[PDB]
Amino acid sequence: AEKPKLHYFNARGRMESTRWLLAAAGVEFEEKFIKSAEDLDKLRNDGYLMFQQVPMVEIDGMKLVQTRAILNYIASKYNLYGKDIKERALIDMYIEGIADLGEMILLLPVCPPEEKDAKLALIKEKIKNRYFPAFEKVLKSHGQDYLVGNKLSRADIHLVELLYYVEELDSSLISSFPLLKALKTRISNLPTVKKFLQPGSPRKPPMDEKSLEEARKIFRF
Amino acid sequence: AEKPKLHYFNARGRMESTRWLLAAAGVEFEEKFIKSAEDLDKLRNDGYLMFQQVPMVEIDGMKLVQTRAILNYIASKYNLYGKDIKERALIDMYIEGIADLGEMILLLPVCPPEEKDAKLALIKEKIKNRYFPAFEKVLKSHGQDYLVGNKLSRADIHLVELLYYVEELDSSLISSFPLLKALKTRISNLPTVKKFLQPGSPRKPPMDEKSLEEARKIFRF
Ligand SMILES: COc1ccc(CSC[C@H](NC(=O)CCCN)C(=O)NCC(=O)O)cc1
Ligand SMILES: COc1ccc(CSC[C@H](NC(=O)CCCN)C(=O)NCC(=O)O)cc1
Ligand SMILES: [Cl-]
Ligand SMILES: [Cl-]
């Protein structure tokens, strides 16, 4: 066959959820790091990018852009997208809420500086009052180890990734959600995830000021 | 099975793409209009909104929130999500680019007054240089009447819907893109879509200042 090839810059950004999903599925991948605007232009000029943007993933003869297109494909291929159309609907509903919260956290450092205090507070309010309660409620309702179908799915993976980012933001926020804490523990002990969490995997660190500036350069924003 | 029931306010907003897809599929549906913050609060209190937000669609016993979850389910249910995983990947890539552009357009009236003109100019540059070229290129690649698999899919529907919104912004934007023009025409003449475009359907008008203010009251922004 061949290893999926992930085109992005050397940072979490919009590619990190794909790294998590592939790693969780046990799929070895290669990365080709964009180091400059000229590298990105080369991808564009070569016809690699449908909308002149990355992430792009080379997989199974396709050149897929758009995070959701990439993740949907990987999830379906590796049986992490539930068993039927109704389980998929629960998965999609859950992971779109996850993606909303993740997007708020992702973009926080590019908030206008004058807006940062209020928005961080609103993110924390939403975690405590909206998102964490929603997921805790799902887990409490069925009492099962996984979010959907009593079986590992992408929803468990995407959620637990987000829990690591929320921990980085403020380690107290999960304190009143024992079922989310338990899910974090369980999923982090699955062999593929536990390996990804260990030093040496493709897992990327928090984006520092420098890495963000590098993004600003490469992507012209 | 129940008739799908769409919960939203009486406007396009985030529910319009669902109205388009159900109508195109020939699926009869009902709408219950949120008229006040109090109506929204009742749906929230009563447990029907996973993330305390609408759109919400009651379909097949589910209370589905998140537009992409709703659309993914409807598309699968009505054979508008292609015929295999690789077709779904093209569809997803295409409709995510459509959603990106649609989101820019949706949010224009909520731009700070002094940023709006520049935002519109940027949207127009993206239409002409990024998005319309990408979709024209797809249509020219196979020369067929539909974007994917030589068969109607959700991609054709979401795209043509967007072409109507672009027309409202500036009827000149499509002028250099004859294949998109022709898709607009053909999809608009499909019996179901034709009927949806005619008066007295659930299709919603452009949101005016009065409807935007109602949104501000109901959703408290
Ligand atoms: C907060 O950290 C980051 C770092 C990088 C990015 C940009 S990701 C690269 C970008 N892709 C997209 O915006 C795709 C979104 C599709 N829904 C990109 O390629 N930008 C170049 C461009 O748009 O011209 C965002 C936040
Ligand atoms: C430009 O016109 C509009 C009109 C209404 C809306 C808001 S749609 C209702 C809103 N839902 C969401 O934001 C869902 C997004 C999930 N990806 C909502 O229910 N707001 C209430 C709240 O968030 O508390 C946005 C632009
Ligand atoms: Cl993306
Ligand atoms: Cl939504």
Q: Which residues contact A28 (CB under 8 A, 6 or more apart)?
A: A3
Whether B77 sits inside 8 A of A85 (CB atoms) is yes
Are the C-beta atoms of A218 and A39 separated by less than 8 Å? Answer: yes
Ligand nearest to the CA of B65: 4
Burial class (CB in 10 A: 0-12, 13-18, 19+), B155: buried
d(CA A28, CA A4): 8
Tell me the three state secondary structure of residue B9: strand
Sheet holding A30-33, edge to edge: A30-33, A5-8, A56-59, A62-65
Question: Would you put residue B7 in left (φ > 0), alpha (ψ -120 to 50) or beta?
Answer: beta
Q: Is B219 in the pocket of ligand 2 (CB under 6 A)?
A: yes
Nearest to B40 by CA among B12, B65, B21: B65
Provide φ and ψ at A40, rounded to 5°.
-70, -40
**For A73, which of B52, B60, B89 is closest by C-beta distance?**
B89
* Cβ distance of B51 and A86 shorter than 8 Å: no
Looking at the CA of A67, name the nearest ligand.
Answer: 3
Method of determination used here: X-ray
Selecting from B51, B60, B134 the residue whose C-beta is nearest the C-beta of A130 gives B51
Q: How far apart are CA B221 and CA B215, in angstroms?
A: 8
Q: Are strands B5-9 and A62-65 parallel, antiparallel or unpaired?
A: unpaired
The finding on whether B215 has its CB within 6 A of some atom of ligand 2 is yes
CB-CB contact of B220 with B37 (8 Å): yes
Amino acid (one-letter) located at A156: D
Which tokens in the block code for residue B28? 């009869």
The single-letter code of the amino acid at B25 is A
For residue B82, give the nearest of B157, B17, B7, B175 by alpha carbon: B157
Domains of chain A: 1-80+190-208 (3.40.30.10), 81-189 (1.20.1050.10)
Beta carbons of A9 and A53 less than 8 angstroms apart: no
Omega of the bond prior to B55 within 30 degrees of 0, cis? yes
User: Residue B176: helix, strand or coil by DSSP?
Assistant: coil
Q: Which long-range contacts (CB under 8 A, 24 or more apart) does A75-81 make?
A: A75/A21, A75/A153, A75/A154, A76/B85, A76/B88, A77/B85, A78/A25, A78/A27, A80/A21, A80/A24, A80/A25, A80/A152, A80/A153, A80/A154, A80/A157, A81/A153, A81/A154
Rounded to the nearest 5°, which phi and psi values hold at A23?
Answer: -65, -45
The residues near B20 (Cβ < 8 Å, ≥ 6 apart) are B157, B158, B161, B196, B203
Contact B71, B21 (CB under 8 A): yes
Closest chain B residue to A130, measured at CA? B51
Closest CA to B203 of B37, B72, B21: B21
Residues with CB under 5 A from ligand 4 (ion): B 14, 67
Pairing of strands B30-34, B5-9: parallel
Cross-chain CB nearest to B86 (options A62, A66, A131): A62
**Distance from the first to the final alpha carbon of chain B:** 36
**Neighboring chain B residues of A68 at a CB cutoff of 8 Å:** 68, 92, 96
Resolution in A: 1.8
The whole-angstrom separation of Cα A180 and Cα A135 is 7
> How many of the other CB atoms lie within 10 Å of CB of A5?
14
Chain A contacts to B (CB-CB under 8 A)? 50-52, 60, 62, 64-69, 72-73, 76-77, 85-86, 88-90, 92-94, 96-97, 100, 130-131, 134
Q: Which residues from chain A sit within 8 angstroms of residue B93, using beta carbons?
A: 50, 64-66, 69
What are the Cα distances from residue B154, in Å, to A3, A138, B91? 30, 30, 8
CA A213–ligand 1 middle distance (angstroms): 13
Tell me the HSE value of B163 on the side-chain side, using a 13 A CA sphere.
23
Write out the two tokens for A40: 């990105």
Mutate one of B59, B64, B67, B72 to test the A interface: name it (highest A CB count within 10 A): B72
Task: Provide φ and ψ at B93, rounded to 5°.
Answer: -60, -45
Measured in Å, residue A13 CA sits from the centre of ligand 3 at 9
| Alpha carbons A43 and A7: distance in angstroms, whole number | 9
- Check B93 against A52: CB less than 8 A apart: no
Structure tokens at B113: 């007054």
